[PDB]
Chain A
């Protein structure tokens, strides 16, 4: 039952929070709610994580994040944030061309 499928998750906890039950149930009853907060939280945690890259690797080429996205949305490059960040990460020359295209608005 639950009495042992707790002692399945409990791996790694510190204290008597891993052997006994009346304590296991607590550090685990949190050990799920945190996972709920982060399967609602990573989707955003990562969002800002992306911009910082694009932000840096375009500010390197003059255009600031706002001008960049403005130019691109306005001249219809519906590429989106994840892959823009990956090209920022891994493709200096094509990304540079991107920044120039978005400078071809403002």
Chain B
């Protein structure tokens, strides 16, 4: 299955207040590197005054980054970048299949 899947991302953050220092540093620090690596993303990096900071992606996947730090916020962006649109549902079976065989499945015949 060849396609990109994270079809859009947001980094909502603040500009006044000590909470969003980590995400602000993240902004100038490692946005451009990841972005130049990933053109397929629509990384629209808007703001939201006075509110505790978070990230969002494709559905809706939200990740708070309050009182966090850039070295980790980079990973917490690359998570979302690798991710699907999945909801977290504990694995059913490790190898999904619609065709399990070439020989016929076992019946009264050998």
Contact = CB atoms under 8 A, between A and B. Distances in A.
A96 B106 CA distance: 12
A89 B105 contact: yes
Q: How large is the interface on A (under 10, 10 to 19, 20 to 34, 35 or more residues)?
A: under 10
Interface string A82-95: 00000001111110
Interface of A is mostly: helix
A57 B105 CA distance: 12
Contacts of A93: 103
Interface string A54-87: 0001001000000000000000000000000000
SS class, residues of chain B in contact with chain A: loop
A93 B109 CA distance: 11
Contacts of A89: 105-106
A12 B110 CA distance: 45
A92 B107 CA distance: 9
Contacts of B110: 60, 92, 96
Nearest to B103: A91
A37 B30 CA distance: 44
A57 B103 contact: no
Contact of B101 (A57, A60, A90, A96): A90
Highest count of chain A CB atoms <10 Å: which of B100, B102, B103: B103
B39 interface: no
B17 interface: no
Interface string B13-24: 000000000000
A85 to B, nearest CB: 12
Nearest to B105: A90
Given A90-B106, A92-B104, 8 more contacts: A60-B110, A89-B105, A90-B100, A90-B105, A91-B101, A91-B102, A94-B103, A96-B110
